[PDB]
Write a protein that binds this DNA or RNA. Structure first.
Lengths: 48, 195, 129, 72, 62, 224, 149
RNA sequence: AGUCUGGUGCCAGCAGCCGCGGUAAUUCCAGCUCCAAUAGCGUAUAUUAAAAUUGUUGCAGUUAAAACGCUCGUAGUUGA
RNA sequence: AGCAUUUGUCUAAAAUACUUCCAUUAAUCAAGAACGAAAGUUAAGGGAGUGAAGACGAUCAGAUACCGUCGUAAUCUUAACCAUAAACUAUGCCGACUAGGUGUUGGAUGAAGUGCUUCCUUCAGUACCUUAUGAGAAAUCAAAGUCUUUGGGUUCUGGGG
């Protein structure tokens, strides 16, 4: 590949790089970090 | 045959010089140690006949246009054009002339014959937008780009230009119905060139 | 370091066709490369090829018919099952009408359609159209 | 339906609307070196002309056709 | 061609479409199944037929 | 009608020495005469008459010492609905003038798209015979043929353009900024142009050539 | 090239034929004897091959005998325990370390000394894998004098 | 889908977004007409498409975000 | 990173040459390690000139600045450390294939000027000019090419402000 391994046994690398690099997105950070349930007052409700 | 070859050989036509284009080396014979290139000329003669063969196969010769930017070549193209019924174009090529449809020099030519495609470059460029094969008398420093027919010659002297067009004219007149090939054409040898 | 010759060779052939060479000199030589050229001849893409003998590695000089739009190699050489072939060709080929996807299968190196008609999966090597 | 045509030299297909590629008409000679009726025509793509390989390719093609003897 | 699912499903679909009245007399091949259009489906409706037979004077009246 | 061509190729068409636009495409001749297209697609006699549509009017401005100048670029789409599309572009200070100039450009621009089958010869030609992808500015647009009953899959602009070209069953896709409409149209037009550029097995066969109109009608061409 | 920035291609060309020259029709025993004499004189296999080409005028041993020189030495049981290549590399590294012991400000000598020892480790690991150095074997700079002694 | 009628006058306010309102408002408040969907239609939060904006397919890294200062090297991946 | 006096010594290096040897030993590499400008820190010299700090004279609306003159720390070497810079060819590295010409530096091959000098052919470096029916958002780029016609191998990196 170019900037990616082709490798038949390189599924390991593809998973780890994808897993680390996913976190950079803002929406993803908001969705999977705990801060959502903490700092927001409504915390998974439309209404209060 | 050999008398015509000899006349070319005595003439200055085959004197190539330094700064010679990559493409053209299959027509060069040898590098002189004195910094000049000898041109084979035998291939040039047969190739000139091929150029004549393409020119003759055109239904109207008066749609076949000759071009020279050069002052000294201007008479030679005009005389060559006069005999074969062609239009000669001398000096500036007005850049829109074939392509533009309202310009004074608006022309739909069949074929273009070029004196040095280095000098006559605007016509060469326009010819490629106008789907024209293009014959070109090419020299050491001349492009071979665009043109289908390349004729090797030194084109920096008046006699050389004139001799090649004169020989071409005799060959075309022979291919035409104008005069039998059996007897030499005696008209205006050493006399197309500038004053 | 050089790795798989075949891809660079096919890119060279593609460049040669783009350039308009008519004949070309492959400096690599191998059994698989020879089989691939024989297959391209089978499908009317390549004409004759001459294998020149040197002990270290022969060379191949291939006469081109100019019919190729592209020839290329897929690396890694993925495994592919018979029903998966339809997805692969839909991805790769310019049309389902023409173009050829090449596998290596237990009945030999052959294109996908022939392999499919036969009935064995295998590994994907390349393609041309 | 439209029928496209190909370059004689390279095998390459010539597009409909390209406006640069050419058809070169070559006259056959008669026995005394007069223009015969017949003309052989060959198709040259713009790319080869832009490269400047047209003269070389034409020479190779003429040699194959027996219209030039000197080959290159 | 010559696949069991394909010939079973195709024959079954064509039979069903003929029964519904979507397909014509020699319309018995897959390009006519693709060929179907929204007015033709609408034409199978009872209000359209009632208008067509002349039982009512309009589709809305039907 | 009574209109005057000043090009010789035009004059051949005016007399009817050339049957179709197909021949002019065959010899790849430049077209600077709208009358050729108007003669061939003869509005009340034509099988598939050319249908116009102003797709996009855009403001552009020079900006000057004494202030702004609004000019109008105009993109228009024309097509027979059967095989010949045309995309025309003109910028002028007045909108209607821009539109007319663009329509004249569109006729000159007129290109044949290759129409064939997705696969089997079970009906009529109906879509591009293979993938074409066309680029303009940032935007690279790919048409890839779909099986029958899969008409005009794509954006509204694409649907219209394919309808003018006479393409039915195809998927479209895109890479880059679609929003820039002139580039988007041009990228489609570039792809449509590529259709007779790709080589196909049917074109493995040897080709031999009809002589030029400039040789076929030489006497009449000198005369008129 | 492994560590340099070049890619120089100066090398042995080799003729097409593997057959003997016209000039020399010598028996295998004569060829073995000539090599044995050079080996006995204390010359190392690269030096012997170079000498065999130049001094004795003979095309190389694999062409005129059909078997490699190292293999011939091994068959007679006389082949060297330490590789010729490894010996020169260790000798160069020892030379650099002696120099580095004197001069602590030579950064390039330090840089090359780690580089060459790393090359020795790679070559050693390959020789261990081909079972030409013991399973228990390891390079050490302390014992390196003893290795090439 | 309206250069429709009054009143308000950066105020009141509306409006995912761009915006409208600071005095002859097509965006506000009413009224009129038009338009969309329809016994359902708004609104919010959650979630998918959209997004070839996480990219195996299928991204981007000269100048827009991004080549570790530089080199060796074990694991790793790739190896005529 | 960086490297310009003379001569010597200790060292390494690349290309060339090779009908010399090995016989797959390799490529790129998380971890870890090496070397790493300038300034700074700590110790000895040295403190010429330059000179953060600082001092005056002006300058100016004010000037704690530019300018002028002075001037400690520092600049230099030795001994430790420190571990970053627009540490920039702003382009990760290896590998193939692609296009001309003008040059240029290190070798080898041939010939003619007068053994040598020149030139020719060829290798390994290395720039420029033109051309890219090659690329790109264009600038530009012979790589940023052979990439929606998308996969030679690999490490690292970015995901609106």
């Amino acid at each position: 590949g170019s900037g990616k391994p082709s490798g038949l046994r390189a599924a390991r690398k593809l998973r780890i790089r994808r897993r680390t690099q996913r976190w950079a997105d803002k929406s993803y950070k908001k969705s999977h970090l705990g801060t959502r349930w903490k700092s927001n007052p409504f915390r998974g409700s439309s209404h209060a | 045959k050999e008398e015509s070859i000899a006349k070319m050989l005595i003439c200055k036509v085959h004197i190539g010089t330094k700064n010679l284009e990559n493409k053209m080396k299959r027509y060069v014979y040898t590098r002189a140690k004195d910094g000049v290139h000898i041109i084979n000329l035998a291939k040039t003669y047969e190739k000139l006949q091929l150029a004549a063969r393409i020119i003759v196969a055109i239904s109207n010769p008066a749609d076949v246009v000759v071009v020279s930017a050069r002052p000294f070549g201007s008479r030679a193209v005009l005389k060559f054009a006069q005999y074969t019924g062609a239009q000669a174009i001398a000096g500036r090529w007005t850049p829109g002339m074939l392509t533009n449809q309202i310009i004074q020099k608006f022309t739909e030519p069949r074929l273009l014959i070029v004196t040095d495609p280095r000098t006559d470059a605007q016509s060469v460029k326009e010819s490629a937008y106008a789907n024209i094969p293009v014959i070109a008398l090419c020299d050491s420093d001349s492009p071979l780009e665009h043109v289908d027919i390349a004729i090797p010659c030194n084109n920096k002297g008046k006699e050389s230009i004139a001799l090649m067009y004169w020989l071409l004219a005799q060959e075309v007149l022979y291919l035409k119905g104008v005069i039998p090939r059996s007897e030499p054409w005696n008209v205006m040898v050493d006399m197309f060139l500038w004053r | 370091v050089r790795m798989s010759v075949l891809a660079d060779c096919l890119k060279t052939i593609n460049n040669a066709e783009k350039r308009g060479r008519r004949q070309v000199l492959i400096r690599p030589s191998s059994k698989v490369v020879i089989k691939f050229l024989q297959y391209m001849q089978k499908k009317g893409y390549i004409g004759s090829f001459e294998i020149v003998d040197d002990h270290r590695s022969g060379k191949i000089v291939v006469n081109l018919l100019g019919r190729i739009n592209k020839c290329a190699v897929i690396s890694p050489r993925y495994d592919v099952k018979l029903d998966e072939i339809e997805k692969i060709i839909t991805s790769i080929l310019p049309s389902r009408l023409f173009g050829h996807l090449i596998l290596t299968t237990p009945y030999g190196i052959m294109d996908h359609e022939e392999a499919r008609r036969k009935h064995t999966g295998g590994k994907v090597l390349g393609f041309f159209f | 339906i439209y029928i496209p045509r190909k370059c004689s030299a390279t095998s390459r297909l010539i597009p409909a609307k390209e406006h640069g590629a050419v058809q070169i008409n070559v006259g056959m000679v008669d026995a005394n070196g007069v223009y015969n009726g017949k003309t052989e025509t060959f198709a040259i793509s713009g790319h080869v002309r832009q490269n400047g390989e047209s003269d070389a390719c034409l020479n190779r093609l003429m040699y194959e056709k027996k219209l030039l003897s000197f080959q290159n | 061609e010559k696949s069991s699912k394909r010939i079973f499903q195709g024959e079954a679909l064509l039979r069903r479409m003929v029964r519904q009245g979507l397909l014509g007399e020699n319309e018995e091949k897959l390009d006519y199944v693709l060929g179907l259009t929204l007015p033709k489906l609408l034409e199978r409706r009872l209000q359209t037929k009632v208008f067509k037979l002349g039982l009512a004077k309009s589709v809305h009246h039907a | 009608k009574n209109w005057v061509p000043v090009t010789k190729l035009g004059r051949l068409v005016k007399e009817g020495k050339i049957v179709s636009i197909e021949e002019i495409y065959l010899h790849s001749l430049p077209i600077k005469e709208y009358q050729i297209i108007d003669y061939f697609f003869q509005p009340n006699e034509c099988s598939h008459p050319l249908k116009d549509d102003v797709v996009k009017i855009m403001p552009v401005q020079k900006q000057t010492r004494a202030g702004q100048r609004t000019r109008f670029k105009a993109f228009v789409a024309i097509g027979d609905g059967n095989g010949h599309c045309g995309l025309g572009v003109k910028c002028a200070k007045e909108v209607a003038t821009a539109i007319r100039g663009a329509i004249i450009s569109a006729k000159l621009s007129l290109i044949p798209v290759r129409r064939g089958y997705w696969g089997n010869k079970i009906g009529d030609p109906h879509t591009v015979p293979m993938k074409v992808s066309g680029k303009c500015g940032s935007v690279r647009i790919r048409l890839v043929p779909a099986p029958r009953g899969t008409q005009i899959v794509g954006a509204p602009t694409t649907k219209k353009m394919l309808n003018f070209a006479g393409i039915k069953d195809c998927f479209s896709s895109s890479c880059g900024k679609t929003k820039t409409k002139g580039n988007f149209l041009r990228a489609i037009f570039n792809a449509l142009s590529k259709t007779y550029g790709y080589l196909t097995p049917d074109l493995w066969k040897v080709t031999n050539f009809d002589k030029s109109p400039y040789e076929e009608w030489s006497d009449f061409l000198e005369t008129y | 090239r492994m560590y340099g920035k070049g890619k120089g291609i100066s090398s042995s060309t080799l003729p097409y034929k593997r057959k003997q020259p016209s000039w020399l029709k010598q028996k295998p025993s004569e060829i073995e004897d000539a090599i044995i004499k050079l080996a006995k004189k204390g010359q190392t296999p690269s030096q012997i091959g170079a000498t065999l080409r130049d001094n004795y005028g003979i095309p190389q041993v694999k062409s005129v005998t059909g078997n490699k020189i190292l293999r011939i030495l091994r068959a007679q049981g006389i082949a060297t325990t330490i590789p010729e290549d490894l010996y020169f590399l260790i000798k160069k590294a020892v030379s650099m370390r002696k120099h580095l012991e004197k001069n602590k400000k030579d950064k390039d000598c330090k840089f090359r000394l780690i580089l060459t020892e790393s090359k020795i480790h790679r070559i050693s690991r390959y020789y261990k894998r081909k079972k030409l150095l013991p399973s228990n074997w390891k390079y050490q700079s302390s014992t390196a004098s003893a290795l090439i002694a």
